[PDB]
């Protein structure tokens, strides 16, 4: 049938919210009160891919925008980008692999691993107002843990 999707927000484990940084990047910062309206709302689609109890393949589109997070090589490195798509054709259940993330639940937090690039994760910096990026580890000083908030 039609792919199933949920509206949501994400925050990193330092409770940094995600906002637009120009047209094709996200950044993470501490937001509270009226300024929280700047945060991006996702449509999380539940897509085709290898799946287990705590590891669920998803796509992350911007709500009612033909823009998806994707993982591609840029200057020979795995990178995170926002990518435009044909709005007639998306979302779909069989999303291309660059758009797929494995949503992993570990100790009440979520990680989003690239399905294309094993052990590369959606990441934020500890510093304020820096890009959301794809990082090659769930170790280190960058943040790879998130929580989701459900949106009407």
From Swiss-Prot:
Changing residue 55 to E: Suppression of integrin binding. Markedly reduced activity. Coiled coil: none annotated. One of its GO terms (molecular function) is cytokine activity. Induction: By LPS. Transcription and translation induced by M.tuberculosis and a number of different M.tuberculosis components in macrophages; EsxA is the most potent activator tested (at protein level). In pancreatic islets, release is increased by high glucose treatment. In pancreatic islets and macrophages, release is also increased by endocannabinoid anandamide/AEA. Changing residue 105 to K: Enhanced integrin binding. Keywords: Cytokine, Cytoplasm, Inflammatory response, Lysosome, Mitogen, Pyrogen, Secreted. One of its GO terms (cellular component) is cytosol. The keyword Ligase does not apply. Expressed in activated monocytes/macrophages (at protein level). A motif (Involved in interaction with TMED10 C-terminus) lies at residues 112-125. The record marks 4 as: Involved in receptor binding. The record marks 55, 63, 65, 74, 88 as: Important for interaction with integrin. GO terms for biological process: apoptotic process; astrocyte activation; cell-cell signaling; cellular response to interleukin-17; cellular response to lipopolysaccharide; cellular response to mechanical stimulus; cellular response to xenobiotic stimulus; cytokine-mediated signaling pathway. Changing residue 74 to E: Suppression of integrin binding. Markedly reduced activity. Markedly reduced activity. (Microbial infection) Cleavage by S.pyogenes cysteine protease SpeB promotes its activation independently of CASP1. SpeB-mediated maturation of IL1B plays a dual role depending on infection site: while IL1B inflammatory response prevents bacterial growth during invasive skin infections, it promotes streptococcal infection of the nasopharynx by disrupting colonization resistance mediated by the microbiota. It is found in: Cytoplasm, Cytosol; Secreted; Lysosome; Secreted, Extracellular exosome. Activation of the IL1B precursor involves a CASP1-catalyzed proteolytic cleavage. Processing and secretion are temporarily associated. Belongs to the IL-1 family. Monomer. In its precursor form, weakly interacts with full-length MEFV; the mature cytokine does not interact at all. Interacts with integrins ITGAV:ITGBV and ITGA5:ITGB1; integrin-binding is required for IL1B signaling. Interacts with cargo receptor TMED10; the interaction is direct and is required for the secretion of IL1B mature form. Interacts with HSP90AB1; the interaction facilitates cargo translocation into the ERGIC. Interacts with HSP90B1; the interaction facilitates cargo translocation into the ERGIC. Potent pro-inflammatory cytokine. Initially discovered as the major endogenous pyrogen, induces prostaglandin synthesis, neutrophil influx and activation, T-cell activation and cytokine production, B-cell activation and antibody production, and fibroblast proliferation and collagen production. Promotes Th17 differentiation of T-cells. Synergizes with IL12/interleukin-12 to induce IFNG synthesis from T-helper 1 (Th1) cells. Plays a role in angiogenesis by inducing VEGF production synergistically with TNF and IL6. The IL1B production occurs in 2 steps, each being controlled by different stimuli. First, inflammatory signals, such as LPS, stimulate the synthesis and promote the accumulation of cytosolic stores of pro-IL1B (priming). Then additional signals are required for inflammasome assembly, leading to CASP1 activation, pro-IL1B processing and eventually secretion of the active cytokine. IL1B processing and secretion are temporarily associated. This is Interleukin-1 beta. The lineage of its organism: Eukaryota, Metazoa, Chordata, Craniata, Vertebrata. The chain holds residues 117 to 268 of 269 of the full protein.
């Amino acid at each position: 049938a039609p792919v199933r999707s949920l509206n949501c927000t994400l925050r990193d484990s330092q409770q940094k919210s995600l906002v637009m940084s120009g047209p094709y990047e996200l950044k993470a910062l501490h937001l509270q009160g009226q300024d929280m309206e700047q945060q991006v709302v996702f449509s999380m689609s539940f897509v085709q891919g290898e799946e287990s109890n705590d590891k669920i393949p998803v796509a992350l589109g911007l709500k009612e925008k033909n823009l998806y997070l994707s993982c591609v090589l840029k200057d020979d490195k795995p990178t995170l980008q926002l990518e435009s798509v044909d709005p007639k054709n998306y979302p779909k259940k069989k999303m291309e692999k660059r758009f797929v993330f494995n949503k992993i639940e570990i100790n009440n937090k979520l990680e989003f691993e690239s399905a294309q690039f094993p052990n590369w994760y959606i990441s934020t910096s500890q510093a304020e107002n820096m890009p959301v990026f794809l990082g090659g580890t769930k170790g280190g000083q960058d943040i790879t843990d998130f929580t989701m908030q459900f949106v009407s």
